[PDB]
Design a protein around this nucleic acid. Structure first.
Ligand SMILES: CN[C@@H]1[C@H](O[C@H]2[C@H](O[C@H]3[C@H](O)[C@@H](O)[C@H](NC(=N)N)[C@@H](O)[C@@H]3NC(=N)N)O[C@@H](C)[C@]2(O)C=O)O[C@@H](CO)[C@H](O)[C@H]1O
Ligand code: FES
Ligand SMILES: [K+]
Ligand SMILES: [Mg+2]
Ligand SMILES: [Mg+2]
Ligand SMILES: [Mg+2]
Ligand SMILES: [Mg+2]
Ligand SMILES: [Mg+2]
Ligand SMILES: [Mg+2]
Ligand SMILES: [Mg+2]
Lengths: 86, 137, 100, 122, 97
RNA sequence: CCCCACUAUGCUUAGCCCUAAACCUCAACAGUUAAAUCAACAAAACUGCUCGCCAGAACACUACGAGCCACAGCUUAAAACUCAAA
């Protein structure tokens, strides 16, 4: 309201490629979190339910980070068998 | 020079012109992508209404208004009333995550209007008012 | 006057070498599987470097190369494990042929 | 204690800006303050539109007043800045130079948590 | 006995603990040029420590300083001042690609 | 259950009420990691010291009594009939 317009969440179009601007804009709002925040603000999320969701999202991150860290550590061993026949 | 995605600040002087007009002078296309409707209103830089169109005004009813075909039709209808008033370049300010959020932008392009920028002005509170309770459907 | 084991370990090159991180060592190729090269460099485990595109032909069994060691043994512990997971190999970068 | 008065004045001319600063610095002395300095941060555009005393401002002058005063002078001086028509916004905060910064040795690595579950074959 | 036995000593090869970019520097609420380096240029949202790369103690000094500068009339909220858009990027975040 | 609308209520001030899956269902303090590791599961197993609590299920977060700004209330809290299981 009291801020200047056409600065925030504004993306300019290059060579009439509007699709790329909208994909770029939608990627800025998702990385910042506005998209999911706008979807969770449509209906009131009770504190107890919001605390149950934050824990699930934090435990999934931990697991997915370690699972990914092991996949990148063991991808060196995805080469051909050097002792083929033994 | 290169191409930046950031809008040209008014104060600092630039060379980006559209039909001899600065970014500030370009008219604005306010799109309100709701869940069951999509309202479009084209205004000038001096807040003068040029065109208004919506799915309801195009002969859609109830659940046909919350579709991408009705939003596109309303964009074509708002791009035909503003093109008679000398509008070519517009600044889109979309408000809402509805179905006709991008479909109305395509309809404006199918009416002879050229989009130079896409602004998002979806109301996000820093907790303010309490929404309706979750539903069991 | 028999030399002890504590004297061998103090004066060994590996011991004096210090941390392997970014250390230039000389390897010996002892086994080649397609492009991959299996290289010994005086350590417990070998390193598996890929054949350089520039001069692949020169890398045959016995060729002595230059390495830049990073780890002497690739290990890590992951969520829930009671011991470290080892791939039984060293990490190093191939820097070409030792041109004596 | 030592405070810092972030003062945002209304965009006016030099004669009126100096009259407000003096009128503001005399209010501190009347409340028992020992003014130490008067820095000028320059006149800039406000980050957002500020509405004060039935006026919508878009520009203002930023002035800092470092001083010493008793604890009871802050509540009396915050009520004086609300009635002045040439003061857009004014806040009093504890001076950041009276808060020593503890030396840091660097980031301490944290090892993954161990022995969280029993070593049994589930 | 034997003189080749090892000795009780702290690791001499140990490397100094890493430090953040803002280690040893004073974070003020008047330095909007430094506080705008840790906020999104489109939304004005404060970045986390996985992006800024700051420590817990300095990440909370930027946060506390940004919130105080915003409500005092020093720093915007919904966007980043365009003047500080051509400043060195220190945060690990790429939007466009 | 879905839609709309609206009230008590949620806010403030002044008093009251005194409850909860008030549950990290894992008392407070001190200590240990050895030995017989430990029914199972869950969040590995123990020691010393102390307070509090519990002894089949149900009747029973009841009845009576007492106390309390509580008068459709809270706290404390039985028995008889009944079953051979829970
Ligand atoms: C090992 N005995 C199990 C047990 O049998 C019990 C069972 O006992 C039932 C009582 O007669 C009845 O009055 C009683 N009814 C009540 N209203 N209190 C039953 O609850 C009781 N069953 C039970 N506790 N599981 O019926 C009785 C005739 C029984 O055979 C005595 O031994 O319970 C039966 C299931 O009710 C099982 O089928 C039996 O295998
Ligand atoms: S590392 Fe020393 S303050 Fe951040
Ligand atoms: K619980
Ligand atoms: Mg009401
Ligand atoms: Mg609780
Ligand atoms: Mg106790
Ligand atoms: Mg009983
Ligand atoms: Mg009860
Ligand atoms: Mg009772
Ligand atoms: Mg009674």
């Amino acid at each position: 309201a009291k801020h200047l317009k056409f600065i925030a969440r504004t993306v300019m179009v290059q060579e009439g490629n509007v699709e790329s601007a909208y994909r770029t804009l939608n990627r800025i709002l998702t990385m910042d979190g506005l998209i999911e925040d706008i979807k969770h603000r449509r209906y009131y999320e009770k504190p107890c339910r919001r605390r149950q969701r934050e824990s699930y999202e934090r435990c999934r991150r931990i697991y997915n980070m370690e699972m990914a860290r092991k996949i990148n550590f063991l991808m060196r061993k995805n080469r051909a068998d050097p002792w083929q026949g033994c | 020079t290169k191409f930046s995605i950031y809008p040209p600040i008014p104060g600092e002087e630039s060379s980006l012109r559209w039909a001899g007009k600065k970014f500030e002078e370009i008219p604005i296309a306010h799109i309100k992508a709701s869940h069951n409707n999509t309202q479009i209103q084209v205004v000038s830089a001096s807040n003068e209404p040029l065109a208004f169109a919506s799915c309801g005004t195009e002969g859609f009813r109830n659940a046909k208004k919350g579709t991408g075909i009705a939003a596109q039709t309303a964009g074509i209808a708002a791009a035909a009333r503003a093109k008679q008033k000398g509008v070519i370049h517009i600044r889109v300010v979309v408000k809402g995550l509805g179905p006709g959020r991008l479909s109305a932008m395509h309809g404006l392009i199918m009416g002879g209007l050229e989009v130079i920028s896409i602004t998002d002005n979806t109301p996000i509170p820093h907790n303010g008012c309490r929404p309706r309770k979750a539903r069991k459907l | 006057n028999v030399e002890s084991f504590a004297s061998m370990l103090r004066h060994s090159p590996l011991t004096q070498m210090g941390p392997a991180k970014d250390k230039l060592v000389i390897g010996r190729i002892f086994h080649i599987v397609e492009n991959d090269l299996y290289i010994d460099f005086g350590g417990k485990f070998h390193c598996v470097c890929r054949r350089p595109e520039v001069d692949g032909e020169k890398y045959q069994k016995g060729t002595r190369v230059r390495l830049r060691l990073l780890d002497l043994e690739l290990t890590s512990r992951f969520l829930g494990a009671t011991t470290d997971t080892t791939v039984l190999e060293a990490n190093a970068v191939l820097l070409g042929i030792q041109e004596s | 204690p030592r405070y810092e008065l972030a003062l945002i004045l209304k965009a006016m001319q030099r004669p009126e800006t100096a009259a407000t600063l003096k009128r503001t610095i005399e209010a501190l002395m009347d409340r028992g303050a020992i003014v130490r300095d008067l820095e000028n941060l320059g006149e800039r555009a406000l980050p957002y539109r500020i509405s004060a005393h039935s006026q919508q401002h878009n520009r203002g002058g930023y002035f800092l007043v470092d001083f010493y005063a008793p604890t009871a002078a802050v509540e009396s001086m915050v009520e004086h800045l609300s009635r002045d028509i040439d003061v857009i916004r004014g806040n009093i905060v504890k001076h950041p130079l009276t808060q020593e910064l503890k030396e840091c040795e660097g980031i301490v690595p944290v090892p993954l948590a161990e022995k969280l579950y029993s070593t049994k074959k589930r | 006995s034997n003189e080749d036995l090892p000795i009780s000593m702290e690791n001499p090869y140990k490397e100094p603990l890493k430090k953040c970019i803002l280690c040893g520097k004073h974070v003020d609420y008047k330095n909007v040029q430094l506080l705008s380096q840790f906020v999104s240029p489109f939304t004005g949202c404060i970045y986390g420590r996985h992006i800024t790369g700051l420590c817990g103690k300095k990440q909370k000094e930027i946060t506390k300083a940004i919130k105080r500068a915003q409500i005092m009339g020093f720093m915007p909220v919904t966007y980043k001042d365009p003047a500080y858009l051509k400043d060195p990027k220190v945060c690990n975040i790429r939007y466009r690609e």
